[PDB]
Design a protein around this nucleic acid. Structure first.
Ligand SMILES: Nc1ncnc2c1ncn2[C@@H]1O[C@H](COP(=O)(O)OP(=O)(O)O)[C@@H](O)[C@H]1O
Ligand SMILES: [Mg+2]
Length: 523
RNA sequence: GCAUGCGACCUCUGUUUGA
RNA sequence: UCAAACAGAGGUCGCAUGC
């Protein structure tokens, strides 16, 4: 692992002391650049005043990952590298850990936290800050909260602040519909993080196209399976429950409307009150059951329901709770017969099955990441893997936050990198940024939509020459929005390539002009 | 529990072209 | 008045993540 020539090139503007943003493609080794910057920070430190470096990483696993690189590289040099975090925060006084540490890796919230906490009131304490996936500097996200602070202190003392460093493979594109606006948005981002130079692989492009490369995002539309009995059955069982509401579908809006009706109603009042807290719930859990089958199997939907109708007995189980539960159990053996179906299943799941086989026969040692939007879905997908004879080649893992333990995470990832047991990892948003599975080959998106940023960062989870990235939708708009992104992403690059062709003064001037939009008076 | 990003939804007030 | 488009201010909700 010898410094690459573009890596040393990207370094330059930061070593000349300037607040840099390092835009360089997903996987190019920006993290190395930042440690290289870090050596040339300690090296060059003037006087007796010495250096504290803080690396900030957005989500926990990325904090862990980067914390561990940084230790393995600087501890042997004889540096104190300590990681404060969500686990560590109410076990340590930040005060000390900084003054003990030459390098602190941090979840960004912690510094925010400890700033309101009193523990800390001077960003001056560090001499270099690094923001991994720095593009997250928006509105009231921690990064900006801290950076607002940084900017205030700039005027309120003009007495040395730390050097800033943004790493990002995805500078973004605001709402910019035109290249001119995309530039206004990028320049906006540079202002938030007080950038004075943007770093690009300018001169060493050829070297860069070697090491990391990217392809298309194979989009796959599957039409909703014609003849869907299950959808009709529940909708009617909901219609009869909506008919009964006056006497006293599978969309987001139905959930929104159920909460409209649950707040309005919150002893001819009191018996009608908790009558609608019985009507709304059943309608809601029917609704959730539709939308759970939308992606999963019917067997997951009916699971979700028996899990509710056996729970209707537990609590009150009043008159109405009996007349509704019974309406279901008449029409239940109809459904459990449909569970047992062969052909009539979600064709999104038929395609994934196809897709995973297509890749695990052609290459038996592939490592996939299957991304889904929601925990429930991610977890329900693990069931869909295990229980399918054609796909249980591979043990599947799951990655998450917590409603999964932070140690339980360390395990599944550490496993998935090198196990050759579980060669596929279903994950959620935690995994979509900054995370480095060297042996990862394929990344599959299961109704994983999104911003340009997401759909750049996610396909970049696929490393190691072997790269492929396959989406699976049934929706029109999702097939399009994503195409839309492939334009926005092209536009994004030019924005920068262009911005880069300005002179020092005029870029600098742009950022100040933008910052001056955010000052504060003193009297 | 709280925060944030993101998405859906709705409202107000204005500008555009249309009928 | 209607429809369609853009933008400024606000209300609610869902997901994910962070503390
Ligand atoms: N000069 C180098 N030579 C060989 N491997 C490198 C070099 N620099 C970085 N890498 C490796 O590239 C992989 C991904 O790097 P990373 O910096 O996380 O990508 P990103 O820039 O998207 O964050 C890591 O395994 C890292 O060790
Ligand atoms: Mg990185």
């Amino acid at each position: 692992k010898k410094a690459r020539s573009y890596q040393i090139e990207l370094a330059q503007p930061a070593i000349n002391g300037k607040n840099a943003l390092i835009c360089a493609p997903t996987g190019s080794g920006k993290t190395f650049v930042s440690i290289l910057i870090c050596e040339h920070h300690f090296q060059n430190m003037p006087a007796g005043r010495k250096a504290k470096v803080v690396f900030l990483a957005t989500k926990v696993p990325v904090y862990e990952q980067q914390k561990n690189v940084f230790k393995h590289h600087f501890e042997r040099q004889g540096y104190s590298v300590q990681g404060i975090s969500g686990e560590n925060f109410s076990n340590v006084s930040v005060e000390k850990v900084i003054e003990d540490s030459d390098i602190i890796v941090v979840t960004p919230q912690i510094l925010v936290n400890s700033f309101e906490d009193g523990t800390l009131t001077s960003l001056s304490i560090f001499t270099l800050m690094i923001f991994d996936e720095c593009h997250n500097t928006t509105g009231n996200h921690p990064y900006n909260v801290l950076m607002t602070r940084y900017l205030e202190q700039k005027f309120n003392s003009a007495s040395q602040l730390p050097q800033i460093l943004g790493l990002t493979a995805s500078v973004g594109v605001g709402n910019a519909k035109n290249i001119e606006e995309t530039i206004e948005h990028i320049c906006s981002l540079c202002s938030y993080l007080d950038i004075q130079a943007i770093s690009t692989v300018r001169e060493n492009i050829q070297e860069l196209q070697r090491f990391m490369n990217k392809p298309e995002i194979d989009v796959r539309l599957v039409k909703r399976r014609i003849h869907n009995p299950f959808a009709a059955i529940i909708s009617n069982l909901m219609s009869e429950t909506e008919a009964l509401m006056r006497t006293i579908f599978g969309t987001q809006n139905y959930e929104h409307w159920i909460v409209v009706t649950q707040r309005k109603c919150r002893e001819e009042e009191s018996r009608i009150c908790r009558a609608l807290f019985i009507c709304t719930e059943h309608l809601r859990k029917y609704n959730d059951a539709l939308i759970i089958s939308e992606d999963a199997r019917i067997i997951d939907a009916l699971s979700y329901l028996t899990e509710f109708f056996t729970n209707v007995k537990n609590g009150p189980y009043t008159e109405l709770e009996q007349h509704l539960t019974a309406k279901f159990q008449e029409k239940e053996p109809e459904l459990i017969a449909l569970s047992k179906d062969e052909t009539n299943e979600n064709p999104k799941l038929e395609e994934l099955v196809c897709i995973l086989d297509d890749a695990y026969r052609y290459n038996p040692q592939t490592r996939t990441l299957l991304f889904a939007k929601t925990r429930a879905l991610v977890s329900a997908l693990k069931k869909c893997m295990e229980e399918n004879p054609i796909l249980n080649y591979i043990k599947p893992g799951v990655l998450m936050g917590r409603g999964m333990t932070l140690p339980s995470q360390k395990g599944v990832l550490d496993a998935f990198k090198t196990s050759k047991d579980n060669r596929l990892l279903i994950a959620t948003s935690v995994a979509d940024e900054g995370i480095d599975i060297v042996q990862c080959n394929l990344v599959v998106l299961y109704e994983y939509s999104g911003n340009v940023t997401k759909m750049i960062q996610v396909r970049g989870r696929g490393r190691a020459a072997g790269s492929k990235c396959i989406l699976v939708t049934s929706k029109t708009e999702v097939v399009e929005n994503e195409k839309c992104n492939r334009y926005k992403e092209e536009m994004m690059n030019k924005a920068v390539e262009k911005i880069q062709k300005w002179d020092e003064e005029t870029f600098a001037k742009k950022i100040h002009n933008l910052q001056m939009k955010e000052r504060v008076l003193r009297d």
